[PDB]
Design an enzyme around this catalytic site. Structure first.
Site, PDB file in Angstrom:
ATOM      1  N   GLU A   1      -3.269  15.401   2.328  1.00 33.04           N
ATOM      2  CA  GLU A   1      -3.851  14.533   1.306  1.00 33.04           C
ATOM      3  C   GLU A   1      -4.207  15.260   0.008  1.00 33.04           C
ATOM      4  OE1 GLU A   1      -3.441  11.530   1.711  1.00 33.04           O
ATOM      5  OE2 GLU A   1      -2.954  11.593   3.839  1.00 33.04           O
TER       6      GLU A   1
ATOM      7  N   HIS B   1       0.833  -1.208   0.000  1.00 35.26           N
ATOM      8  CA  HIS B   1       0.000   0.000   0.000  1.00 35.26           C
ATOM      9  C   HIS B   1       0.868   1.258   0.000  1.00 35.26           C
ATOM     10  CE1 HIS B   1      -4.015   1.955   0.660  1.00 35.26           C
ATOM     11  NE2 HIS B   1      -3.203   2.943   0.998  1.00 35.26           N
ATOM     12  N   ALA B   2       0.763   2.029  -1.084  1.00 33.89           N
ATOM     13  CA  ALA B   2       1.640   3.176  -1.351  1.00 33.89           C
ATOM     14  C   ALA B   2       1.667   4.184  -0.205  1.00 33.89           C
ATOM     15  CB  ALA B   2       1.236   3.860  -2.651  1.00 33.89           C
TER      16      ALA B   2
ATOM     17  N   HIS C   1      -6.671   1.054   5.600  1.00 28.31           N
ATOM     18  CA  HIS C   1      -6.639   2.079   6.648  1.00 28.31           C
ATOM     19  C   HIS C   1      -7.297   1.623   7.941  1.00 28.31           C
ATOM     20  CE1 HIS C   1      -6.085   4.127   2.821  1.00 28.31           C
ATOM     21  NE2 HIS C   1      -5.535   5.138   3.467  1.00 28.31           N
TER      22      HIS C   1
ATOM     23  N   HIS D   1       2.753  14.587  -0.828  1.00 28.41           N
ATOM     24  CA  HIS D   1       3.204  14.431   0.557  1.00 28.41           C
ATOM     25  C   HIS D   1       4.680  14.811   0.682  1.00 28.41           C
ATOM     26  CE1 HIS D   1      -0.374  12.601   2.225  1.00 28.41           C
ATOM     27  NE2 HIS D   1      -0.349  11.606   1.356  1.00 28.41           N
TER      28      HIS D   1
ATOM     29  N   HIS E   1      -0.014  11.819  -6.118  1.00 23.44           N
ATOM     30  CA  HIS E   1      -0.538  11.900  -4.752  1.00 23.44           C
ATOM     31  C   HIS E   1       0.586  11.776  -3.721  1.00 23.44           C
ATOM     32  CE1 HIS E   1      -3.404  11.357  -1.382  1.00 23.44           C
ATOM     33  NE2 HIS E   1      -2.473  10.537  -0.927  1.00 23.44           N
ATOM     34  N   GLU E   2       1.403  10.740  -3.871  1.00 22.03           N
ATOM     35  CA  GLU E   2       2.494  10.483  -2.938  1.00 22.03           C
ATOM     36  C   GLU E   2       3.574  11.566  -2.982  1.00 22.03           C
ATOM     37  OE1 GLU E   2       2.052   8.495  -0.636  1.00 22.03           O
ATOM     38  OE2 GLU E   2       0.436   7.219  -1.428  1.00 22.03           O
TER      39      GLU E   2
ATOM     40  N   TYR F   1      -9.341  12.171   4.032  1.00 22.74           N
ATOM     41  CA  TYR F   1      -9.612  11.992   2.605  1.00 22.74           C
ATOM     42  C   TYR F   1     -10.913  12.670   2.166  1.00 22.74           C
ATOM     43  CZ  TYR F   1      -5.833   8.595   3.091  1.00 22.74           C
ATOM     44  OH  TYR F   1      -4.645   7.964   3.392  1.00 22.74           O
TER      45      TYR F   1
END
Ligand SMILES: *[C@@H]1O[C@H](CO)[C@@H](O[C@@H]2O[C@H](CO)[C@@H](O[C@@H]3O[C@H](CO[C@H]4O[C@H](CO)[C@@H](O)[C@H](O)[C@@H]4O)[C@@H](O)[C@H](O[C@H]4O[C@H](CO[C@@H]5O[C@H](CO)[C@@H](O)[C@H](O)[C@@H]5O)[C@@H](O)[C@H](O)[C@@H]4O)[C@@H]3O)[C@H](O)[C@H]2NC(C)=O)[C@H](O)[C@H]1NC(C)=O
Ligand SMILES: NCCCC[C@H](N[C@@H](CCc1ccccc1)C(=O)O)C(=O)N1CCC[C@H]1C(=O)O
Ligand SMILES: *[C@@H]1O[C@H](CO)[C@@H](O)[C@H](O)[C@H]1NC(C)=O
Ligand SMILES: *[C@@H]1O[C@H](CO)[C@@H](O)[C@H](O)[C@H]1NC(C)=O
Ligand SMILES: [Zn+2]
Length: 595
Positions: free
Chosen positions: A376, A318-319, A478, A352, A348-349, A488
């Site tokens: 997020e 899970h990324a 999660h 962060h 997305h990553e 989210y």
């Protein structure tokens, strides 16, 4: 005059906390990259040691009259230090909680199922084997097989651990004088009306979701037949292209408004051009730097894991994105595949990562998002412009595309299948856990309480009859990994506030100009949009989040106006299309969970 001494105390303590958290993070990274009994032991023992130090820190804060101080900044820092979370638990209770958490996350990460066609081959993992089938197969019995196998192993197997986790989470929250873990989580948003605000926004968008749901169900009936999909019942979730039905974009080819007109799916062109995980991350890096934002440091390239390891080892695929709290030591662990969806995940990553780099100069306690939803939202803002026909044509991934009215509706619908469909999903993840944390559901009713929410809000249901003999919530990452989910919901709302303002700043959106629609905005190369990101992200958590929003676009309020503005052309078309086709809207209560 005590403030002078306190200022020096905080400066030193923040640096000590960063250093101690570096050690914990390295251990947690090692375990996530490489699940073993020995790494588990190491992760949890370092965590226990850091928890012990935090406790002493919280105790030491009482020696300072910090509530009496003139400086809002000093007071804000001290307040952050008093909040212990799980570290408030007695030594033994914290150790038990850590063991329970690793039991759940490792169980999730080690799930393997048998092939639908070959009961001898039993090494299919969620990522990538099972997810490939869920996204690609249109055989409803095959889909139902994989759904049941995965939920039984990822969800039900972990019920007793999940129960103890709820108990210890509640004990922890109460030791911090919150009513439950729900209040502990909500504290991160620094607003006592936050729940009501989200209920209000959700209620405004819910009618659009109902229209999308109705149209999708209509289209699925044409594909699978009425024996599989009823007109008036909740949609069987295994048909929606995603293991949790959280986003439906994977079935766009069979539910698209105009099937004779283009639907964007660049996965094939990515493969044809010889794209690699490395190239995907380099392209994401290019997008940020193009906006005059910070380039990925060498440690990122040296230390990140961007492909699933080819040895026999167990890991969390899970990324995720990681801050190590030094300087420029930031990393991603992603089992990257060459697909359109994965390209968005890369962005997305990297959102962060950018946030980490932007606030790394802040004192330790401020080295986090303005609120969890802000963290997020960053990467998704870029993903929104990456997803546009405008951008995809620039990078040669979308060819021979004619953007007429019908193509535009297809693209808006495709975006909605990800962005609108997700809203009720995200809300239910935390409504469920909040209700358990608050002690509002008896243990005898825990599983059907989950499915009741999924029905009420999303209008989906399991492919097979479930009961209280099953326990399905932890089948979602999660939930097994104890990651708050409201971030989210918040993100999916505020990312449109960010996107709209960034697009206005880039000269890419004008509501009175037909040639500049919001749904085709590309912020690539925009230093003006990047400046707004820098202003906001560099703050970290130094100020309450409305001040961080104000630094971006002068606004102080979380609002559903921007998301509704984005989808307004779709709403007008869809309402009319549903009336044209006499589409049933709404659903009967599900019969798929026996109480
Ligand atoms: C969550 O909520 C909890 C309450 O539900 C809270 O627990 C309370 O924390 C209090 C500390 O802030 C603590 O108060 C102390 O009480 C001591 C005696 O209480 C005992 O006996 C009681 C029987 O009557 C029992 O009911 C209790 O369980 C205890 O066993 C006192 O000895 C103590 O006093 C000293 O400390 C104060 C300090 O206060 C400040 O001092 C500075 C001096 O620099 C002043 O300038 C300032 O104005 C202020 O007064 C001194 O004033 C005093 O001289 C003594 O040295 C203190 O009052 C309380 O016992 C405890 N429990 C309960 C049930 O009340 C948790 O702390 C909360 N948790 C979090 C994380 O916030
Ligand atoms: N094909 C899935 C890629 C997942 C990407 C992303 N991952 C999460 C990982 C969160 C995490 C928290 C604490 C410890 C370790 C990890 C993220 O927000 O990056 C995510 O979960 N996201 C992105 C938005 C929605 C949400 C999801 O998918 O439910
Ligand atoms: C994983 O950890 C084990 C011990 O727990 C170690 O021996 C091994 O080298 C690690 N594997 C990898 C691929 O790093
Ligand atoms: C790049 O960022 C700096 C500050 O970080 C800013 O001053 C400068 O104007 C930006 N570059 C451009 C071309 O705008
Ligand atoms: Zn994220």
């Amino acid at each position: 005059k005590e403030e002078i001494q306190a200022k020096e105390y905080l400066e030193n303590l923040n640096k000590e906390l960063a250093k101690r958290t570096n050690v914990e993070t390295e251990a947690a990274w090692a375990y996530g990259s490489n699940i073993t009994d020995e790494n588990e032991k190491k992760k949890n023992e370092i965590s226990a040691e850091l928890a012990k130090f935090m406790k002493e820190v919280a105790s030491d804060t009482t020696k300072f009259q910090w509530r009496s101080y003139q400086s809002e900044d000093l007071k804000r820092q001290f307040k952050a230090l008093t909040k212990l979370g799980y570290a408030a638990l007695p030594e033994d209770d914290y150790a038990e909680l850590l063991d329970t958490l690793s039991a759940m996350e490792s169980n999730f990460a080690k799930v393997k199922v048998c092939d639908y066609k070959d009961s001898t081959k039993c090494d299919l993992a969620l990522d990538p084997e099972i997810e490939e089938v869920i996204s690609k197969s249109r055989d409803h019995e095959e889909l139902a097989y994989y759904w049941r196998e995965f939920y039984d192993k990822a969800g039900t197997a972990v019920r007793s651990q999940f129960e103890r986790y709820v108990e210890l989470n509640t004990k922890a929250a109460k030791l911090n004088n919150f009513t439950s873990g729900a209040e502990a989580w909500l504290d991160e948003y620094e607003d006592d009306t936050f729940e009501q605000q989200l209920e209000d926004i959700f209620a405004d968008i819910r009618p659009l979701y109902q229209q999308i749901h109705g149209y999708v169900r209509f289209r699925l009936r044409k594909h699978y037949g009425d024996a599989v999909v009823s007109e008036t019942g909740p949609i069987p979730m295994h048909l929606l292209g995603n293991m949790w039905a959280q986003q439906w974009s994977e079935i766009a080819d069979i539910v698209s408004p105009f099937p004779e007109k283009p639907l964007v799916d660049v996965s094939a062109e990515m493969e044809k051009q010889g794209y690699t995980p490395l190239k995907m991350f380099q392209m994401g890096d290019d997008f940020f730097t193009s906006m005059n934002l910070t380039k990925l440091p060498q440690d990122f390239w040296d230390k990140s894991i961007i492909e699933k390891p080819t040895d026999g080892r167990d890991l969390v695929c899970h990324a995720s994105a990681w801050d190590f709290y030094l300087t420029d030591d930031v990393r991603i662990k992603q089992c990257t595949r060459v697909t359109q969806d994965q390209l968005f995940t890369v962005h997305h990553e990297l959102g962060h990562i950018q946030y980490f780099l932007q606030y790394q100069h802040q004192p330790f306690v401020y080295r986090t998002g303005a609120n969890p939803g802000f963290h997020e939202a960053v990467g998704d803002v870029l993903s929104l412009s990456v997803s546009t026909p405008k951008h995809l044509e620039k990078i040669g991934l979308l060819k021979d595309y004619v953007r007429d009215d019908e193509a535009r509706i297809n693209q808006l619908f495709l975006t909605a299948l990800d962005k609108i469909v997700f809203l009720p999903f995200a809300f239910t993840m935390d409504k469920y856990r909040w209700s358990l944390f608050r002690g509002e559901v008896d243990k005898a009713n825990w599983n059907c309480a989950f499915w009741k929410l999924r029905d009420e809000y999303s209008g989906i249901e399991p492919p097979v009859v479930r009961s209280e003999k099953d326990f399905d919530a932890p089948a979602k990452y999660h939930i097994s990994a104890d990651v708050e989910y409201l971030r989210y919901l918040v993100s999916f709302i505020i990312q449109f506030q960010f996107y709209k303002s960034a697009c206005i700043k880039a000269g890419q959106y004008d509501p009175d100009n037909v040639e500049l629609p919001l749904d085709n905005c590309d912020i690539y190369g925009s230093a003006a949009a990047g400046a707004a990101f820098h202003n906001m992200l560099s703050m970290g958590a130094s100020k309450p989040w409305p001040d961080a929003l104000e630094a971006f676009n002068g606004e102080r309020i979380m609002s559903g106006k921007a998301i509704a503005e984005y989808f307004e052309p779709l709403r007008v078309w869809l309402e009319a299309e549903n009336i044209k086709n006499n589409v049933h809207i709404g659903w009967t209560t599900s019969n798929k969970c026996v109480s």
